[PDB]
Amino acid sequence: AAQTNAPWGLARISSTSPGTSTYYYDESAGQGSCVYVIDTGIEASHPEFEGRAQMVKTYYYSSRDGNGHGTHCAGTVGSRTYGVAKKTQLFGVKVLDDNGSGQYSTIIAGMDFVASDKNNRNCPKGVVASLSLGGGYSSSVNSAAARLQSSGVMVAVAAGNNNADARNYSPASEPSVCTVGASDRYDRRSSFSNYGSVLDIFGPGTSILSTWIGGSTRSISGTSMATPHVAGLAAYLMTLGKTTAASACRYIADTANKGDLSNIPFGTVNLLAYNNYQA
Ligand SMILES: [Ca+2]
Ligand SMILES: [Ca+2]
Structure with missing residues (x-):
């Protein structure tokens, strides 16, 4: 399948070169997979989600996204126009x-919630968690993400801005x-x-157009935007069956666009997320 005039980030992960405007993808489009968007929440009513997004957990007075960051990142995961996996189920934490x-x-509580709640959902293709958040070093935050990963969830986190x-x-x-990284x-x-040896992959992070609260759209920047890609x-x-949650990060780096990025400091991976699609 081909989406013309797609956001540059979608077209970039479907191409070996930059400067294209068409996002090429297999029409399965993440059907049967689930992505937990652990963020500010998701405005699940946004027309772009087509009924595939829903709130599953909040840790505040409302499950409503009053910020827009979580809706934006959810939209980058799998909204109809701005999403990588246009048929995936979006769960908002x-x-x-x-x-x-x-x-x-x-945030540790939310990660532990996903590790358990995925056992109540229908995700025959696999479970993914998008952590578009970051703070200083914390051995407990690291451990919660490691537990999320070990429980059988593809954990993607932002490198930081x-x-x-x-x-x-x-x-x-x-x-x-x-x-x-972005x-x-x-x-x-x-x-x-952010950079360093702990980085595994780069994605489109600068000027990423996606959904926003109030049924709207906007473009923003951050490694928090590259993470949902x-x-x-x-x-x-995972829906295509080429990878599993334990092996998806390692598989994505193996099939990435190598050496295509500039200003990559020595020691940091030069790998760009790439869906490797051949129409
Ligand atoms: Ca290239
Ligand atoms: Ca890693």
Whole structure:
């Protein structure tokens, strides 16, 4: 299947070169997979989700996304127009308040919620978790992501937007998950993107157009935007049966666009998420 004039990020993960505007993907499009968007929540009523998104858990007074970050990242995972896996089921876990902040204990609780709740859902193709959040190093935040990963969930986390080494940030520094750095439309490392050896993959992170609260859309930047690309990519490939949750990050790096990014500091992987689709 081919989506013309797709957001540059979708077209980039379906191409070996930058500058295309068509997102090519297998029409299964993540059908049968589930992605938990652990963020500010998801406006599940947005027409772009077509009934495939729903709130499953909040840690605040409402499950409503008052921020828009979670709806944006959910839209990048699998909204109709802005999503990588356009047929996937989106579950929203609101661990961050309407200002975008959250306690580590709340974020650890949300990760442990996904590890259990996936046993009550119907995800025959696999379970994915998109963690578009980051803070300083925390051995407990790292451990919760490792437990999420070990329980059988493809965990994708943002490398962080500090232009620093990601080893000082959690859950980015947890090696068992999929730490995702950010790139722009000219295949440069995003100027904000964290780097380091703990990084596993890069995705489109600068000026990512996706859903927003109020039934709207907007473009924003961050490794928090590159993470749902890889989370949606993992969901998309798990549905195709090419990978599993334990092996998806390793598989995505093996099939990535190698050496195509500039400004990648020495020691940091030069790998761009790539769906490897051949129409
Ligand atoms: Ca290339
Ligand atoms: Ca890793």
